[PDB]
């Protein structure tokens, strides 16, 4: 309603560098808000692609940011008779951030890795890897959950079980507020997808530089199935948390999964122990139900609801046509001990090929009216297919129908704008939450302030 | 915290056999490899081998192939070394280790088991 | 097997010393190296991995440092605790090897 489309703040990457792909608010230790953001096709040490972050401090008139420094270089490690290789050509550092309290995570989910003994070898696979800084003193630890040292030869032998050559970890991220990271893995377990916890200390505590295989005994992964309903079912394209049990002292997982069951796709709930509580099953194959998901409750009621993006949903047009434009679901979590109905609400894209819902941002309460807020995105909606960010007010039943606010890209054809976005957080100071948003198709991010309501919706 | 409770002084005949325990305490034996050590006054510290208590899978010096047979059980979180055609050079005092974070690192010992053979 | 040559065998020095123990492999094993401690009729505790870090727990007047094939232990103001022996062990390849030790005894 009330984000100001005339005065916005334009921060640059270089070109080709696919600056914007991911971004987040960061807040120093003194509650100064900046912007991370992620490049994952920034030119390396060796003029060739290996992503990079960058760390823009707020200001109005916006401009370039300094990068946040991580090492670029290949590792080697002859340890225990073996070959240890990390591969970060074309890793995509940057290809998803988040930030908790001070400190940044940045992942390179394309990162490989391979082990050598003799004549054998691991395989060169893309494990991924996530690095951690703490921008203010200059600390710096690595994640690499999936990294193993087990021979091609033995994963044949046993069927090829609990193997997490093809992770990908850090292809999505999320961080508990009791500071646990958690990587999604959409590759692991051959292509099941699986979710990588560790607590943000001992994965500091625990890393030193030039060990590459080392033991984070207090995180937690998720488990191979032999479900063929999970086959392919890229568990972990996308993730959340959020509290859906009633009980606060333990955190619940959101998992998008969206070729799940034959690219049915689903959404899971599941407690910290990787126990599913619940799960919500797509409408339509192949629309990518899972692509995103946001939790915020929308209702006032104290409750955190469910949003699920499926960008790539067909809905049902005259004379027994499908058109391609994207559609959005809303659960409301229901009192007490009680499973999520169908959806409340269901939003559709307009525009074909718009890919409404690719992006799922809550934006906190924007116009102050006491209901929680969301920003969904349509990278390629609006009726120049530029892309198109659109605002829904919450409410005591839910969410509106109707866009309060339309956001159109002021950038190119191609831009990709609304592939990323970010809310509920107010990097001005002036009382009311903004949003900023990514379009790494032209090396950018926007910055939409909100300003004070003029008539009120 | 990580402690490895090894079983108690063992004392056989020449010619037997003998099953030496490692019980973990205040983590899963199954997190990281384990290693045995032997050590006695004049020769010092001789690696035995290792094993992944997560799949069975072990390494042994070729010195000690056929004498010495590494196993686990994750169900009772304990590692085992097994001795056969005990001998007086067998006689030493035997540690189970496993690393702290580093994978191939040697960090945290259990506090050893005795073992004498004699007539 | 890489052989892991330990000195010296012993030293005799006193509360408040700087002392350092070396080992010397026979090839290069890039500081795939630990060092351990053995107290007086007790059993080992971890002091160094990976050639210069220090296991958690440890104190800082402990320091490990060297490359290729010659690292170094070295204790600055010795403690009365420090009076034990030490070893050196290699995980640059199978099998692992051990250093002949060192036994660090009071000075009179």
């Known amino acids: 309603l009330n984000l100001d489309p005339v005065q916005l703040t334009f921060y640059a990457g270089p070109n080709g560098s696919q600056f914007g792909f991911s971004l987040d608010f960061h807040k120093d230790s003194h509650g100064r808000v900046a912007i991370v953001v992620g490049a994952p096709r920034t030119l390396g040490p060796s003029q060739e692609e290996t992503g990079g972050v960058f760390l823009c401090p707020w200001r109005a008139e916006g401009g370039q940011c300094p990068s946040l420094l991580f090492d670029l270089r290949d590792e080697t490690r002859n340890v225990g008779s073996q070959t240890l290789q990390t591969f970060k050509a074309r890793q995509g550092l940057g290809a998803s951030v988040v930030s908790w309290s001070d400190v940044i995570v940045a992942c390179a989910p394309w990162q490989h890795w391979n082990v050598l003994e003799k004549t054998e070898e691991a395989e060169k696979t893309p494990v991924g890897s996530c690095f951690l800084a703490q921008p203010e003193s200059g600390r710096r630890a690595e994640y690499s959950p999936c990294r193993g040292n087990t021979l091609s030869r033995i994963y044949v032998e046993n069927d090829f079980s609990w193997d997490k050559r093809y992770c990908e970890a850090g292809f999505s991220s999320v961080v508990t507020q009791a500071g646990e990271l958690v990587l999604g893995a959409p590759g692991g377990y051959y292509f099941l997808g699986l979710l990588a916890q560790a607590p943000v200390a001992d994965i500091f505590s625990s890393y030193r530089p030039g060990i590459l295989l080392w033991h984070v005994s207090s995180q937690s992964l998720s488990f191979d199935s032999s479900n063929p309903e999970y086959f392919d079912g890229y568990w972990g394209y996308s993730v959340a948390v959020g509290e859906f049990d009633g009980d606060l002292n333990t955190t619940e997982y959101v998992v998008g999964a969206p070729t799940w069951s034959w690219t049915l796709g689903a959404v899971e709930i599941l407690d910290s122990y990787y126990q599913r509580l619940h799960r919500l099953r797509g409408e339509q194959m192949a629309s990518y139900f899972g692509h995103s998901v946001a939790v915020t409750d929308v209702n006032g009621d104290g409750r955190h609801d469910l949003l699920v993006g499926a960008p790539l949903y067909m809905e049902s047009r005259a004379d027994r046509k499908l058109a391609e434009v994207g559609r959005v679901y809303l659960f409301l979590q229901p009192r007490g001990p009680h499973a999520l109905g169908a959806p409340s609400l269901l939003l559709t894209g307009t525009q074909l090929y718009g890919r409404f819902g690719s992006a799922i941002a809550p934006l906190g309460d924007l116009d102050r009216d006491g209901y929680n807020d969301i920003a969904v995105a349509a990278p390629y909606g609006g009726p120049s297919g530029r892309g198109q960010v659109l605002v829904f007010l919450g409410q005591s039943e839910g969410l509106r129908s109707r866009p309060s606010q339309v956001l159109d890209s002021p950038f190119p054809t191609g831009s990709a704008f609304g592939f990323s976005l970010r809310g509920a957080v107010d990097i001005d100071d002036n009382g009311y939450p903004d949003l900023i948003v990514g379009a790494y198709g032209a090396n950018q991010v926007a910055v939409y302030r909100a300003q004070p309501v003029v008539k009120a919706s | 915290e990580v402690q490895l409770q090894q079983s108690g002084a063992e004392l056989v005949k020449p010619g037997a056999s003998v099953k030496l325990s490692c019980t973990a305490s205040?983590?899963?034996?199954?997190?990281?490899?384990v290693h045995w050590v032997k050590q006695r006054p004049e020769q010092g510290l001789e690696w035995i081998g290792r094993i992944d208590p997560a799949n069975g899978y072990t390494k042994y010096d070729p010195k000690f192939q056929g004498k010495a047979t590494i196993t686990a059980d994750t169900s009772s979180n304990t590692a085992y070394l097994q001795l056969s055609s005990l001998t007086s050079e067998d006689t030493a005092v035997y540690y189970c280790?496993?690393?702290?974070?580093?994978?191939?690192?040697?960090?945290?010992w259990g506090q050893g088991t005795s073992v004498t053979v004699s007539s | 097997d890489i052989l892991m040559t330990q000195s010296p065998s012993s030293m005799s020095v006193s509360l408040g010393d700087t002392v350092s123990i070396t080992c010397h492999a026979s090839?290069?094993?890039?500081?795939?190296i630990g060092w351990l401690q053995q107290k007086p009729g007790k059993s080992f505790m971890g002091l160094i991995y990976?050639?210069?870090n220090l296991v958690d727990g440890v104190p800082s007047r402990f320091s490990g440092s060297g490359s290729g094939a010659d690292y170094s232990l070295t204790i600055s103001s010795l403690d009365s605790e420090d009076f034990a022996d030490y070893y050196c062990?290699?995980?640059?390849?199978?099998?692992?090897?051990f250093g002949g030790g060192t036994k660090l005894e009071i000075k009179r």
């Open positions: 090839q290069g094993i890039s500081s795939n």
């Open positions: 062990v290699q995980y640059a390849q199978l099998p692992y090897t």
């Open positions: 205040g983590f899963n034996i199954k997190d990281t490899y």
């Open positions: 990976y050639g210069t």
């Open positions: 280790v496993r690393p702290l974070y580093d994978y191939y690192a040697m960090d945290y």
